[PDB]
Amino acid sequence: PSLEDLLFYTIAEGQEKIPVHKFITALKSTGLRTSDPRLKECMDMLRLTLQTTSDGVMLDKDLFKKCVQSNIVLLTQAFRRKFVIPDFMSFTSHIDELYESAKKQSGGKVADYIPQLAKFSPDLWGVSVCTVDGQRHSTGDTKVPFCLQSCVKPLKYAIAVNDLGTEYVHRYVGKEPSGLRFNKLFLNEDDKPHNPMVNAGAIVVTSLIKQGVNNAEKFDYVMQFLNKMAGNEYVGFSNATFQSERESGDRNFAIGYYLKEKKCFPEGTDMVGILDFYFQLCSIEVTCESASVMAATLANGGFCPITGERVLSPEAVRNTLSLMHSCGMYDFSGQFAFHVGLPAKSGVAGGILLVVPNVMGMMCWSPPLDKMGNSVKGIHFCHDLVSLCNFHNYDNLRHFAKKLDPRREG
Amino acid sequence: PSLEDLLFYTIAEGQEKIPVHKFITALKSTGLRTSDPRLKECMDMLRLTLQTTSDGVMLDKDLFKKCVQSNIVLLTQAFRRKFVIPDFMSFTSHIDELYESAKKQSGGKVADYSPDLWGVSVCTVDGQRHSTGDTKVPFCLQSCVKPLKYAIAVNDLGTEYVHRYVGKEPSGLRFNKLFLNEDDKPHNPMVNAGAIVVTSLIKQGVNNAEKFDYVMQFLNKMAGNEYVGFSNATFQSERESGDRNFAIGYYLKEKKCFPEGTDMVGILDFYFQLCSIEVTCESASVMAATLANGGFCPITGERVLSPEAVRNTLSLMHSCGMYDFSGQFAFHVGLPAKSGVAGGILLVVPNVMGMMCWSPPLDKMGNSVKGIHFCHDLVSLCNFHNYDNLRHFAKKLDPRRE
Amino acid sequence: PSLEDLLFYTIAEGQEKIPVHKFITALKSTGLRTSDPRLKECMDMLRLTLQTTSDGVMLDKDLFKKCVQSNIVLLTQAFRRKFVIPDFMSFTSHIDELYESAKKQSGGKVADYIPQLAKFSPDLWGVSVCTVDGQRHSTGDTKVPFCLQSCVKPLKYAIAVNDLGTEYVHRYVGKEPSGLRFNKLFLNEDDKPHNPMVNAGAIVVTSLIKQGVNNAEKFDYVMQFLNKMAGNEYVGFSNATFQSERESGDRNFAIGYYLKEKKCFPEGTDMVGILDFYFQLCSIEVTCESASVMAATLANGGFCPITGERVLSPEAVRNTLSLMHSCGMYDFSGQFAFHVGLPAKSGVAGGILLVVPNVMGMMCWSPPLDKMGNSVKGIHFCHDLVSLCNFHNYDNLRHFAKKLDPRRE
Amino acid sequence: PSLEDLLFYTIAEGQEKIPVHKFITALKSTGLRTSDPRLKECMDMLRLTLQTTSDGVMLDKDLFKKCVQSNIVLLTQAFRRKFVIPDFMSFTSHIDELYESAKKQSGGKVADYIPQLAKFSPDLWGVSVCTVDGQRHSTGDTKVPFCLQSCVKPLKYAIAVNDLGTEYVHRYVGKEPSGLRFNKLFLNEDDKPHNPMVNAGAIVVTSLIKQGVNNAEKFDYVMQFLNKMAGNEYVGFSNATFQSERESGDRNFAIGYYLKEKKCFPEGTDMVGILDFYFQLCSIEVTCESASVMAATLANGGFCPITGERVLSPEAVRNTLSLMHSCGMYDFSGQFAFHVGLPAKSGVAGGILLVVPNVMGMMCWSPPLDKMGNSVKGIHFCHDLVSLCNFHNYDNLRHFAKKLDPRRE
Numbered sequence A: 001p002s003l004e005d006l007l008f009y010t011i012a013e014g015q016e017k018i019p020v021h022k023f024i025t026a027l028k029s030t031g032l033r034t035s036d037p038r039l040k041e042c043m044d045m046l047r048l049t050l051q052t053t054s055d056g057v058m059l060d061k062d063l064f065k066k067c068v069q070s071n072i073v074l075l076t077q078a079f080r081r082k083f084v085i086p087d088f089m090s091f092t093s094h095i096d097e098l099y100e101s102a103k104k105q106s107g108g109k110v111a112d113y114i115p116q117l118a119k120f121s122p123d124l125w126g127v128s129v130c131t132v133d134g135q136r137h138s139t140g141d142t143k144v145p146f147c148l149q150s151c152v153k154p155l156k157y158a159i160a161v162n163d164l165g166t167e168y169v170h171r172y173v174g175k176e177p178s179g180l181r182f183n184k185l186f187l188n189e190d191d192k193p194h195n196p197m198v199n200a201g202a203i204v205v206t207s208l209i210k211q212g213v214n215n216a217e218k219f220d221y222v223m224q225f226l227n228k229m230a231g232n233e234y235v236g237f238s239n240a241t242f243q244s245e246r247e248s249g250d251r252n253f254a255i256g257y258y259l260k261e262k263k264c265f266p267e268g269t270d271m272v273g274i275l276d277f278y279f280q281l282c283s284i285e286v287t288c289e290s291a292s293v294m295a296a297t298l299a300n301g302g303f304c305p306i307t308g309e310r311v312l313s314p315e316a317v318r319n320t321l322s323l324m325h326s327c328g329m330y331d332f333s334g335q336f337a338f339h340v341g342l343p344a345k346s347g348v349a350g351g352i353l354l355v356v357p358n359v360m361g362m363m364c365w366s367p368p369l370d371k372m373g374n375s376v377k378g379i380h381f382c383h384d385l386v387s388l389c390n391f392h393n394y395d396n397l398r399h400f401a402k403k404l405d406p407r408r409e410g
Numbered sequence B: 001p002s003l004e005d006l007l008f009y010t011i012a013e014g015q016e017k018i019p020v021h022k023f024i025t026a027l028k029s030t031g032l033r034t035s036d037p038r039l040k041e042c043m044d045m046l047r048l049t050l051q052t053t054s055d056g057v058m059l060d061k062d063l064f065k066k067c068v069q070s071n072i073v074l075l076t077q078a079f080r081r082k083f084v085i086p087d088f089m090s091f092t093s094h095i096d097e098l099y100e101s102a103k104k105q106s107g108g109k110v111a112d113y114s115p116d117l118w119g120v121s122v123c124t125v126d127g128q129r130h131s132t133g134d135t136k137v138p139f140c141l142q143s144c145v146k147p148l149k150y151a152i153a154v155n156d157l158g159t160e161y162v163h164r165y166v167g168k169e170p171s172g173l174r175f176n177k178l179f180l181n182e183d184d185k186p187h188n189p190m191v192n193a194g195a196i197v198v199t200s201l202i203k204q205g206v207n208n209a210e211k212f213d214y215v216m217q218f219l220n221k222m223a224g225n226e227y228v229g230f231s232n233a234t235f236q237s238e239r240e241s242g243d244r245n246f247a248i249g250y251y252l253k254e255k256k257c258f259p260e261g262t263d264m265v266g267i268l269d270f271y272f273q274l275c276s277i278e279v280t281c282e283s284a285s286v287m288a289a290t291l292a293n294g295g296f297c298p299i300t301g302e303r304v305l306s307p308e309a310v311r312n313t314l315s316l317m318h319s320c321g322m323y324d325f326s327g328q329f330a331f332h333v334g335l336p337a338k339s340g341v342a343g344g345i346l347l348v349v350p351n352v353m354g355m356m357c358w359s360p361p362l363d364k365m366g367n368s369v370k371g372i373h374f375c376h377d378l379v380s381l382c383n384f385h386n387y388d389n390l391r392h393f394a395k396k397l398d399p400r401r402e
Numbered sequence C, D: 001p002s003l004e005d006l007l008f009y010t011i012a013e014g015q016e017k018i019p020v021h022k023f024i025t026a027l028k029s030t031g032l033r034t035s036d037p038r039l040k041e042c043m044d045m046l047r048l049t050l051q052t053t054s055d056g057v058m059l060d061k062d063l064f065k066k067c068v069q070s071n072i073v074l075l076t077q078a079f080r081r082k083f084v085i086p087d088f089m090s091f092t093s094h095i096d097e098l099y100e101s102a103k104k105q106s107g108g109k110v111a112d113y114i115p116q117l118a119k120f121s122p123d124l125w126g127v128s129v130c131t132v133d134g135q136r137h138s139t140g141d142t143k144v145p146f147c148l149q150s151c152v153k154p155l156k157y158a159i160a161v162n163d164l165g166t167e168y169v170h171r172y173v174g175k176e177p178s179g180l181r182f183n184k185l186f187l188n189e190d191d192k193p194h195n196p197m198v199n200a201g202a203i204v205v206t207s208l209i210k211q212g213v214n215n216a217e218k219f220d221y222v223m224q225f226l227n228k229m230a231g232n233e234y235v236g237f238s239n240a241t242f243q244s245e246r247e248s249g250d251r252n253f254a255i256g257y258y259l260k261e262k263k264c265f266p267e268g269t270d271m272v273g274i275l276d277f278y279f280q281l282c283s284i285e286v287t288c289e290s291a292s293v294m295a296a297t298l299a300n301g302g303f304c305p306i307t308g309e310r311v312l313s314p315e316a317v318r319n320t321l322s323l324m325h326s327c328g329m330y331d332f333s334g335q336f337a338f339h340v341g342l343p344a345k346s347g348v349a350g351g352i353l354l355v356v357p358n359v360m361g362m363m364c365w366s367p368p369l370d371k372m373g374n375s376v377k378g379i380h381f382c383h384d385l386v387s388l389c390n391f392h393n394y395d396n397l398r399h400f401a402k403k404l405d406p407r408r409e
């Protein structure tokens, strides 16, 4: 036997040769993009042969084997329906219906407290999916950059835990939701911020990362980390959002001074500098597509699904998912945990970073926010998604009534 | 081909005939008990055969088929290693090590309002069973009954109705003192005020004796008809010592928290009865396993709770099940669990197993010292944490694998 | 000289004899009522003289001395303008204006959680004054009985402090207002109710009075005490209000069980009986007139101004006034202390028991309550009263701007 | 007759002439000091005379009249026992015993969070009295300057109410104590600081004074105001304390940014400059003697007793006294109101500014603080002071048991 040959026969369907377009089309139907970083050698060899061979455009068992040899494992998993969602085409058509249904929820108000948030249209709405196997889908405004804002909080907490361990980080920040009106206190009674997902907690976490080096390096370090989480897709920076965040951060300066007086930072912290670093981190830009890969990295135990690279330790990923479960959605976190049961994090630019553990990551984005600060369409989408699929953390994988399970076939 | 014969040959060893003891020994090794209610027909057929011919007592291909035909599917899944934990005996030896390690945590004080009793029982979603320690000693559910009666109410009345009367969130680590949240509902079903309201929703219109019978019948189904009892002694002491519960009851009454037509004073008495319901570790593990198994009881196959009832209960055990330790427990253990003052910890590993840990000595937060220690070790050892990853899990063992 | 004689000359006005009506009219103008218990011998002797002497109706120096001799000390202070408010007639005409101004404030809702409060007309409005010298004035519906309700809380706290002392009583109840939303908590962090003026605190205080004896005695004992505080004017009991208070007291039973579980009562307390005693104390009846005398006893350091009897210890009175100042007006207590600056206690029946220390006591009553549970007209009356007179706790007695001071001439 | 004449004879004792020293000793006997600003013309005349006739040094009726005539009203009133405390010498010996009793309470910890407070000896202890008539007494370390710190909060709140009125000022700050652990919150539910006596409230109040003008003038204005309040006795500034307060005021900066974001300041406020002004105000220095005069201005309805000058409106003084009663002693405020019943304000330097309305002002100073931030010796002195005298706000002026009343003879 031979695996490249075994693939060859499955796609050849009996003909002597496989047209290249027929291989490309079958590959995309699995959900992979041809630009997948794990498929580069196969795509390079295909492009090279379609130069050497303008006598084609067809691959015999020879030529096919030459192209797929270096990525044969992933291609076999792709073609033998071994991905976490085997019938990805059916699933993306469900994603699209959920998208269109959320598209009609027109309520909410865009964040307008700084000019670069009232700038974004209330009609932008995009959702991107990235499975733990790298299968991709996007519908709507998914290549429009927007700032992570508080969607960055779980990402930088994961970085802190990855670099420093659970015990160190939670010497400085708690691990629990505060309560439906302790949402207003900066500190719990151990004089720690309640958890990493609130502003006082995120400010302390920001103060833990890459200590001793300057802010430009700290930022480069977190940015390269975000690059790996996103499989090197778009991670950027909105200096416009940064200038306004630093001009409108009286509440954060109030938090910073409160934390300083209560001795909440690591020894030797320049609190005013940390606030500026914190302001920078909330102005980091993503698209729905690149952010979906970040969420998928968290869905995938800390491995980036489109590169195969280990980005975060399991401990960092587990802790981050645990705190997104209970603290990720502002005052809606309890209701969201109950009704959706998925680790998620919202931001004031309208993003919702969503993790379906072991299945996929998602970024939902629509700027108009509800009274709690969460994107109206994203929240609607996340309720619909769990209504349709047995993705709720406490759905059962065997008995799930009439929910669809996209991990199954028939 | 044929499934009974193929099963016969896998057990046959090539040999012509199967000793009956060899089949029992092979069956017990899968984790199933011979008393399993779903194997009743097969054990019935074996009992009849083990009279017919005692110069055997050997099952030829014909006679083996005679006994196993009506349970062949369940027996095949057991023998073809298809259960949720395939190498079940390896797993139970890990349970034993975990048990012995918690056995050395002697601290804590029994609720006094025995310190050397300690048992853990496992029931997987496929009905594989294991116990270590004092697992057939009855004890009262106390607050371990709160998720069970909440599931019953959601099962019979739906989420929307039940949560007109009770919230669905933890209160906060010093809002644990308030009976009502901001909408004048108790915070969640896992606190006493919430459980009192939930008690007032079950089987309205009938008297408390019927209500109790109905809850007992429901708990029987949850436990696949294993031990469910009632401790009148605990009931009397709970009711003579329930000043705080009367305080909660009167507070709820004044604040219009009960369904219209509620006799609050009677509900408190019903409530005292429910916390005095008795289980063992073994029967309670089946109850937990029903919650682990989407509401189907694993040793009978019966649909006991709606998926909605089970999901809601697991969600609220995640965040509210372990008193002031609920947040730390959700973070560090990541499993839906519920503790009780008699020393019980009802533990659910969704899609895998249910467990009851029982050890009366409680820590400062009211949770059984040994149980809490066991639950930390268990997730430290296996990738059972709610937010462990199933593919990349570092050095943890995954008992679902081979 | 002679005290009766010189007083005789002060009233005689050169005339040889004093008409009896001329003496009575001058006596009433000081603010005393002829029925004042400290004037009994003089009034009995006057009535007797108008029988023996239907050849009158005039009192010569001999006869005037015969009638006023045994109350000459009080009568001299009355007639020599020595009372705390010398020009009482002027003062009561201000009280009347204040009354009429508050009468036009028609807002508020009569308490209706029990039928005996809901029946009370929203248009009843009465204010009664009793000075620390026993001078009296009333305008409006001042002889209509109503239940003290929470106006009894400072009185029973005073009884407890009088009988048991500050230190003992405040082992069981604090001495501070709770804060603008610790009003829903039954206990402060030391597991005591915050102060005696909240329900939980009053229930605990109720549990301290005459421990060991049964409720009928306890009630008689407290009633004896209120009688003296009111100079034996009307103190009654509304059994109808008691039956309704006890059948609808879920929150008080919730408080009762919480306190028992937290061991807030003295050892040997029958908590459910204490709740029953507590409901009885809230159903005790007064009028504006009689309750004003109770307030005046508190205004007068524990002596009842119309009998001269010592009723409460100064320690009991100071403590009670201190806590009415800061905790007497429900959630309005801080605003009331700031703007009115007087020890006061409201109740759900519309009463406001009001104390101007060293000056007078008042009961204001009008059933309609505002959102905080305080009588709309009483609250309006009490603001106006301090706007007009330098009675605020922290008004100055020497420099008080445009305010009137009724203690001066 | 003649007022200078009668007075001369009362001091003359029938004798021919009054030696000047005998008049001075007699005057101090009333409690007034010879440096009293209202006695300047008389002391000027005495100084001129103590040159003319150094064959003396004695004043005949003519010469005495020459000296005392322009201060005759105050001098008679002093010499005829007409002051608020007639037997002032008796009173100061009670103060001395109270002083000596508190001197034996050596506990407490000197504030050390800035090096200017840790410099102060734990053994410094001073008490100064100034009555509403200007009678003066001091025992201990009463001319050692220390900073007001939070004792300034009532003074600047009084200024703000005096300049802007009650209604405007309390658009920005509440009028109530918060509760014993809403003490960690910066704002009440109306997004106002709870009261002017907490840091958040004092910071907002600072932002109201002389708006629109820069900080240097604002500070000058407050210093002139404090000068009037102290009858021009010692008011200074500790720049060292100011520098330390401002580099270590993280919680105050946290409060400032919180108030700014919640829009708690008047339109056009530079919050960071207000914090700087606020730190300056807490570094203003007094002695026990001068601060006692400021307290006496508050005891005297806004008139400074040693100058006769109107300094604050009665409204400003009433409000400040009201909020010192309930909010002036940090977490001890409720206990202090209950047990001492006097408006007071403590500060971290160990000062307690104490007001007995209509009677006297006091400054107590001893750096060692208790766990709540109040001076251990000051707190002890203030309890003893009211255990001894019927100065409690709700003591009765007529029936006060065995307490001493220094207003009586």
Ligand SMILES: O=C(Cc1ccccc1)Nc1nnc(OC2CN(c3nnc(NC(=O)Cc4ccccc4)s3)C2)s1
Binding pocket: A181, B177, B178, B179, B180, B181, B182, B183, B184, C184, C185, C186, C187, C188, C189, C258, D181
């Ligand atoms: O005092 C202590 C100890 C302590 C006291 C003070 C400081 C620290 C510690 N522990 C006590 N625990 N219970 C008490 O008596 C109650 C049973 N009570 C309920 N009252 N109100 C409820 N529901 C709402 O108010 C709605 C709501 C409004 C705002 C926020 C949240 C909810 S539930 C009060 S005292």
Ligand SMILES: O=C(Cc1ccccc1)Nc1nnc(OC2CN(c3nnc(NC(=O)Cc4ccccc4)s3)C2)s1
Binding pocket: A184, A185, A186, A187, A188, A189, A191, A258, B174, C181, D182, D184, D185, D186, D187, D188, D189, D190, D191, D258
């Ligand atoms: O000290 C601790 C430790 C502790 C935690 C839990 C229990 C006990 C002890 N925790 C913190 N304490 N202060 C903090 O920084 C703040 C500046 N803050 C303000 N937040 N909110 C304000 N104003 C209103 O909310 C309106 C309002 C609404 C309802 C009631 C009262 C007021 S002012 C918080 S964190």
